[PDB]
Amino acid sequence: YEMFAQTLQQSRGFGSFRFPSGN
Amino acid sequence: NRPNRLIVDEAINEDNSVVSLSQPKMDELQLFRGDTVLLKGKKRREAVCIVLSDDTCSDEKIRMNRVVRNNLRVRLGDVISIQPCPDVKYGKRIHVLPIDDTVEGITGNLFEVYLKPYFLEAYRPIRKGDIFLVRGGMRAVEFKVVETDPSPYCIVAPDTVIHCEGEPIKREDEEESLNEVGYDDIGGCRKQLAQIKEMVELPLRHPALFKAIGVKPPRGILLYGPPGTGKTLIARAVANETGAFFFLINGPEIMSKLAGESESNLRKAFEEAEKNAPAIIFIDELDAIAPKREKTHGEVERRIVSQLLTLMDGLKQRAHVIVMAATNRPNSIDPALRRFGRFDREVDIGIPDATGRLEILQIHTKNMKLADDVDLEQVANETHGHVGADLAALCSEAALQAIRKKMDLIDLEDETIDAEVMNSLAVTMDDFRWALSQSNPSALRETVVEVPQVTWEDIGGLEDVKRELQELVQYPVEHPDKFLKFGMTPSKGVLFYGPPGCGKTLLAKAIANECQANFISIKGPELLTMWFGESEANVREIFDKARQAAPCVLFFDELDSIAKARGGNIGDGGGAADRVINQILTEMDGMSTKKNVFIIGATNRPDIIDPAILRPGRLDQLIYIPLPDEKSRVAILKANLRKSPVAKDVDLEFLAKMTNGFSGADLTEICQRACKLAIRESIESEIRRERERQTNPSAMEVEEDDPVPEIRRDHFEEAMRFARRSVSDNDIRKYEMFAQTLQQSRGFGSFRFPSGN
Amino acid sequence: LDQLIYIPLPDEKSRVAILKANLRKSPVAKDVDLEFLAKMTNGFSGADLTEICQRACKLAIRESIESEIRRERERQTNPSAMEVEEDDPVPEIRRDHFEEAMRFARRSVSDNDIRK
Amino acid sequence: SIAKARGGNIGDGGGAADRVINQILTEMDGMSTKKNVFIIGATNRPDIIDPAILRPGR
Amino acid sequence: RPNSIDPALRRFGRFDREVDIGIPDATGRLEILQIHTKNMKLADDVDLEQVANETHGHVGADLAALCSEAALQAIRKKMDLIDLEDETIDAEVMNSLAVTMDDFRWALSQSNPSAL
Amino acid sequence: IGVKPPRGILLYGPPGTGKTLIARAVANETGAFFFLINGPEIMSKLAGESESNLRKAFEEAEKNAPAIIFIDELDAIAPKREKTHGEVERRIVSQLLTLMDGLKQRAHVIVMAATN
Numbered sequence A: 001y002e003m004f005a006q007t008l009q010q011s012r013g014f015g016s017f018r019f020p021s022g023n
Numbered sequence B: 001n002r003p004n005r006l007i008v009d010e011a012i013n014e015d016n017s018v019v020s021l022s023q024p025k026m027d028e029l030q031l032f033r034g035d036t037v038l039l040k041g042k043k044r045r046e047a048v049c050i051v052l053s054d055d056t057c058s059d060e061k062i063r064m065n066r067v068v069r070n071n072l073r074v075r076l077g078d079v080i081s082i083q084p085c086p087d088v089k090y091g092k093r094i095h096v097l098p099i100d101d102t103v104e105g106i107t108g109n110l111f112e113v114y115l116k117p118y119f120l121e122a123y124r125p126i127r128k129g130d131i132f133l134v135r136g137g138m139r140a141v142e143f144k145v146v147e148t149d150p151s152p153y154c155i156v157a158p159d160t161v162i163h164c165e166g167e168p169i170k171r172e173d174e175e176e177s178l179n180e181v182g183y184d185d186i187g188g189c190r191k192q193l194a195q196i197k198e199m200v201e202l203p204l205r206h207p208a209l210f211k212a213i214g215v216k217p218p219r220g221i222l223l224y225g226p227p228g229t230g231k232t233l234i235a236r237a238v239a240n241e242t243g244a245f246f247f248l249i250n251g252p253e254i255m256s257k258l259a260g261e262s263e264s265n266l267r268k269a270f271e272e273a274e275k276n277a278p279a280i281i282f283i284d285e286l287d288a289i290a291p292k293r294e295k296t297h298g299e300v301e302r303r304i305v306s307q308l309l310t311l312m313d314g315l316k317q318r319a320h321v322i323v324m325a326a327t328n329r330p331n332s333i334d335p336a337l338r339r340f341g342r343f344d345r346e347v348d349i350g351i352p353d354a355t356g357r358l359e360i361l362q363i364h365t366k367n368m369k370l371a372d373d374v375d376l377e378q379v380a381n382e383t384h385g386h387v388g389a390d391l392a393a394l395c396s397e398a399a400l401q402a403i404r405k406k407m408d409l410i411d412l413e414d415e416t417i418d419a420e421v422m423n424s425l426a427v428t429m430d431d432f433r434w435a436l437s438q439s440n441p442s443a444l445r446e447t448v449v450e451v452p453q454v455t456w457e458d459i460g461g462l463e464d465v466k467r468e469l470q471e472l473v474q475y476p477v478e479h480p481d482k483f484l485k486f487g488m489t490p491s492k493g494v495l496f497y498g499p500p501g502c503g504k505t506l507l508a509k510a511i512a513n514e515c516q517a518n519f520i521s522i523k524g525p526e527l528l529t530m531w532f533g534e535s536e537a538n539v540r541e542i543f544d545k546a547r548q549a550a551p552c553v554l555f556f557d558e559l560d561s562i563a564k565a566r567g568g569n570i571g572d573g574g575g576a577a578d579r580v581i582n583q584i585l586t587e588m589d590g591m592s593t594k595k596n597v598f599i600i601g602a603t604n605r606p607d608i609i610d611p612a613i614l615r616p617g618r619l620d621q622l623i624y625i626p627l628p629d630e631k632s633r634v635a636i637l638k639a640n641l642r643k644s645p646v647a648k649d650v651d652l653e654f655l656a657k658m659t660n661g662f663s664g665a666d667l668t669e670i671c672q673r674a675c676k677l678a679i680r681e682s683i684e685s686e687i688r689r690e691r692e693r694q695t696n697p698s699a700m701e702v703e704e705d706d707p708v709p710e711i712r713r714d715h716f717e718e719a720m721r722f723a724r725r726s727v728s729d730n731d732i733r734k735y736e737m738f739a740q741t742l743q744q745s746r747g748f749g750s751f752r753f754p755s756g757n
Numbered sequence C: 001l002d003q004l005i006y007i008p009l010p011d012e013k014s015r016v017a018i019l020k021a022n023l024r025k026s027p028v029a030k031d032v033d034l035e036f037l038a039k040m041t042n043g044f045s046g047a048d049l050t051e052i053c054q055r056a057c058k059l060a061i062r063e064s065i066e067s068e069i070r071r072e073r074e075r076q077t078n079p080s081a082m083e084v085e086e087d088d089p090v091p092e093i094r095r096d097h098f099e100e101a102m103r104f105a106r107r108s109v110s111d112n113d114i115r116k
Numbered sequence D: 001s002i003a004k005a006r007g008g009n010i011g012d013g014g015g016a017a018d019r020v021i022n023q024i025l026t027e028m029d030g031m032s033t034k035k036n037v038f039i040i041g042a043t044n045r046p047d048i049i050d051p052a053i054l055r056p057g058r
Numbered sequence E: 001r002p003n004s005i006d007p008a009l010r011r012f013g014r015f016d017r018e019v020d021i022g023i024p025d026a027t028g029r030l031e032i033l034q035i036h037t038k039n040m041k042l043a044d045d046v047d048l049e050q051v052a053n054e055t056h057g058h059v060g061a062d063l064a065a066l067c068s069e070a071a072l073q074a075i076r077k078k079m080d081l082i083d084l085e086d087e088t089i090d091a092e093v094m095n096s097l098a099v100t101m102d103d104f105r106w107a108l109s110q111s112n113p114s115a116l
Numbered sequence F: 001i002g003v004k005p006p007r008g009i010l011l012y013g014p015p016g017t018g019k020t021l022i023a024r025a026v027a028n029e030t031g032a033f034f035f036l037i038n039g040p041e042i043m044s045k046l047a048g049e050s051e052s053n054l055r056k057a058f059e060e061a062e063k064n065a066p067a068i069i070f071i072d073e074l075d076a077i078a079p080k081r082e083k084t085h086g087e088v089e090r091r092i093v094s095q096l097l098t099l100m101d102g103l104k105q106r107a108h109v110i111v112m113a114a115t116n
């Protein structure tokens, strides 16, 4: 059940998404 | 214990009249670095010198040059009184004479060529009775100060005239020369020379004191290394430093004789060495005399081996005799010579590293005049796998190319000899760049044992991994007392695992740099070579090299190679069985924990590894190394491009945002591809601008004279569309699954001790 | 070899004695309850108990070193007093170290293996 | 040739292991880059080749 | 080793009685250290029993060389005692010198045993 | 000049490529005292006569400096160690190794040798 729970895992590398803030 | 008494120590500075002292001894003696001091030694002979200050100089000892050392009849470890003299004034005339055996080949005037820049601007204090040395012009020549009109302590002023009229005279018979070799002529083996000094000096320098000590000395020292490392040179230098009766024994000279003549030569050698105690006996090429028992066919050679074994055991008479011997490998020796009371102390003279190679080049380029184009440091960085004899031959080849290319200088001296022609010749950088192409080294097959140069700055992120590695490695080295207090056994090994191309080798080299330890790398092809050839007895020979260079980090790269090559845990029916991994486990269980040898493995397929490696007392830590994050990608892109000229218009932080899911090797690939695009643009611009413009030029030269490109935005912008991901998604899911099969716990997170009353 | 002797997983008193025998070298505070510690660990082996003891010891060593470095270097470079005013090693192995090292412990032997 | 002759990446159970290709990889990793010796291979069956040859530095 | 001998020397009326002198254990190593440290003066920091417990796979000649190396490290580190006797001989200087525990802790790192 | 020369040059190739011819041509061009040494002529002699021929050859070449010594078929004199059964041939190999190392006297003597 832990393996099947990890086969539907959230994401990889999208945790640090931020919109750019300029000017 | 009055402070004017000083013990002779070797000086780092190569100036011929400058001594050095420490700061608190000089402050206690109340002197200053501007003072010109006077020294007194044996046989009423003196030396006037300029003293300075130093922090690396020891307190009770004085550092001086070998020129000052041989001009006092004083060796190391002796005593010299010092007297300050503010009465040192200028001279009247200076009359020196050359010495015949150093001017046998040189000719012409030596005054303006050598003596005029020698006394220029240095304000050298000289004395009647001293002998100094001048290098330059592919020759070193010495001059004895014969006659001076004023007081013997005097400073050479530029007003003082120097007289050089007279025949080249011979020396006094008690005087030394450059025929013998000192400690300065040897580079790159400071630790081994220190060990030989510790073993050899204290018994031989003080025979009666050490005899009153009563503790037995060592009496057999076995030097070994690759061919050409200069073992004969080190033995002769230590023999010339201690000044004992040195006698040389050469193996083929004995084995070229008849039957009884070899034994007569050995017995006469040891008798004449025991007469002149203290003495040093050096036996060169020991394996030519005493090889293994299976190889000495015949009776007479086994008889000679037994004669040597008899005389080494009969040497134990407390006769102050030390026997050194050199060989090319410790395995070919008859093992009866390894016993106690015989050749038991072993010194490993390895191949030199880059600092050592730089010191060898500085030693061999003393006399030769040298153009300012060259950079010896870059030469020492480019020579890889070069023993010191290769470096001497390289300097020889560069000098011969420089003399060859000046065929007009061959015309300048057809048969006449001028010192000024050799003074007029220097060596360019392209001579060394040519000599690196016709250099055939002899040490590419050798295992490299050195400290790495990769720091933590080359690696991006991995902070908890950095913390756990320094906790596992650095703490038992620095603080053993805590492990004695709390009473645990420090762990022995670490297995890294993860996707390919993510910096496992860099982490091993980084922690080896952090702890300042040696590093031994063993790749997958060597393990596969041992598996195909069934030569798994070389593993013990690896671990012996690991013990001889302690503290050390032993890195087994691609530990799953034989298991992947066998069937991939599928073919041949067997499971997790191997000759080589078995021998590695035996050697891991064998070794002691006091030696501080730390073992690191690294795999890409952690499922097919042998589970018997992961037991306690072995590689028991498992560390997962994922694909790099965004700040790590920034640091990787910075670390790859330090050598290249990158325009400041390039945004790397935008470049790390697009590349979600790359490894390190992909980023190095795209950087090198942009570099290839830049090189192509530069070459195809230069060819057109030079050749296609005009054949017969309008202007006198090229009007531009400007290299156009650097690496800029459009190169990365073009090289991006060739980049690809090396690691797919299912592969990453496999490593995540194996990481979860070693999960921490379930339900033990809320454990608390009961708190009652 | 004709005698066959089966050696099972250790019982509760055996787990108490294993936890006592592993920790004779280490300075353990007297506030620690080992008899409560053997009740939770139903189904561990000996190697799991040695693992969790050595992990608590690692946590204690890390706390001692990262306290000593800060207290010596970070306090003052040029000292106010003549020497260190504390001159006292702070840690021993205590409750929070076992309490933290418990959540990394795992069972090595599954149920089907025991059934075999 | 040896990979085709062995099993065609099918027989003998093993995968991409060879004495001779191992020695070629060792000699490729050994040599210096200053000598200007350039190595060229050629196959007709690129699927059954050893993947350890296709790494960088090779 | 008993295997390299010509087996005709094993017969009766010849070399038939065999005595096996094995490597010594920890009590034996302690007795060897006590034998070799008779004449040498000795500071009270050291504990020879812990030294005998830590030396594993050491023949008695290794222990004699270890005592030699610790004594030479102790004479080496006192370079002020090298200054105290440049060429004169005093019995009191050798009377004034003892060997610390860290000399033995250093000599265990440069010890290459022969019986692992 | 003072830079050391090379003093041993080893020509090698397949049989019949004309190595003897190249050596004789360079010897006739430079005009130095050329002396020829042939391997089977040495190995056809008795025990002491081979060493006497080698020593007389190098003495008479060192008298007429500058000189070139050519040793044809070097493998007939000095093969591998496993192949030189007997004592006298190993003795001749050691004689050659002695004389090549004793040649370093700055005596303007160059030694060439050919093999297959």
Ligand SMILES: Nc1ncnc2c1ncn2[C@@H]1O[C@H](COP(=O)(O)OP(=O)(O)OP(O)(O)=S)[C@@H](O)[C@H]1O
Binding pocket: B185, B186, B187, B188, B226, B227, B228, B229, B230, B231, B232, B233, B234, B328, B352, B360, B363, B387, B388, B389, B390, B392
């Ligand atoms: N580290 C070094 N320092 C100074 N000179 C060196 C060094 N290594 C090599 N050389 C020089 O290279 C030559 C090596 O001479 P040797 O002392 O005979 O070396 P070697 O290790 O004894 O070679 P073998 O084993 O006797 S054939 C000499 O001309 C040395 O001056």
Ligand SMILES: Nc1ncnc2c1ncn2[C@@H]1O[C@H](COP(=O)(O)OP(=O)(O)OP(O)(O)=S)[C@@H](O)[C@H]1O
Binding pocket: F014, F015, F016, F017, F018, F019, F020, F021, F022, F116
């Ligand atoms: N490249 C060449 N130029 C001129 N003559 C050659 C050449 N190659 C062979 N020869 C002739 O072929 C013969 C070869 O004689 P050698 O000099 O003895 O050759 P070799 O290589 O010394 O054979 P070995 O090894 O001594 S049996 C002579 O007659 C040469 O003149």
Ligand SMILES: Nc1ncnc2c1ncn2[C@@H]1O[C@H](COP(=O)(O)OP(=O)(O)O)[C@@H](O)[C@H]1O
Binding pocket: B458, B459, B460, B461, B500, B501, B502, B503, B504, B505, B506, B632, B635, B636, B637, B639, B640, B664, B665, B668
């Ligand atoms: N933290 C990092 N910083 C910079 N480069 C890295 C980093 N990690 C990996 N690399 C890149 O990876 C390459 C080394 O790969 P490596 O980790 O040795 O592969 P493997 O783990 O298969 O041995 C280097 O060329 C380097 O540029």
Ligand SMILES: [Mg+2]
Binding pocket: B231, B232, B284, B285, B326
């Ligand atoms: Mg030698």
Ligand SMILES: [Mg+2]
Binding pocket: F019, F020, F072, F073, F114
């Ligand atoms: Mg011929």
